Amino acid sequence: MGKLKWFSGGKERSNQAENIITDLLDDLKTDLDNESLKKVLENYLEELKQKSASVPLILSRMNLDISKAIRNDGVTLSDYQSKKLKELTSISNIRYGY
């Protein structure tokens, strides 16, 4: 929301994850594979917008949310997908939870 633009990376670690999620969302647009899964990325992505929940506090649950969504509807993340997943993975402090 707002005057958002395209950005690879930067000092803003919080805004970083938000930008990443937006990526998959693009190709996911009117996708044939994932249709309901996007609900996770989109929803979680909105969390970062709020100043209540912590960036790394929401991202941690994300992995636990998407992962479960896999076996659910037998979803499969593409190469770039699974790769971009490791993004907020290393940034998030809650890595042991996984």
From TrEMBL:
GO biological process: bacteriocin immunity
InterPro entries in UniProt: Bact_Immunity_Domain_sf (IPR053739), LciA_Immunity-like (IPR015046)
Descriptive protein name: Putative piscicolin 126 immunity protein
Organism: Carnobacterium maltaromaticum
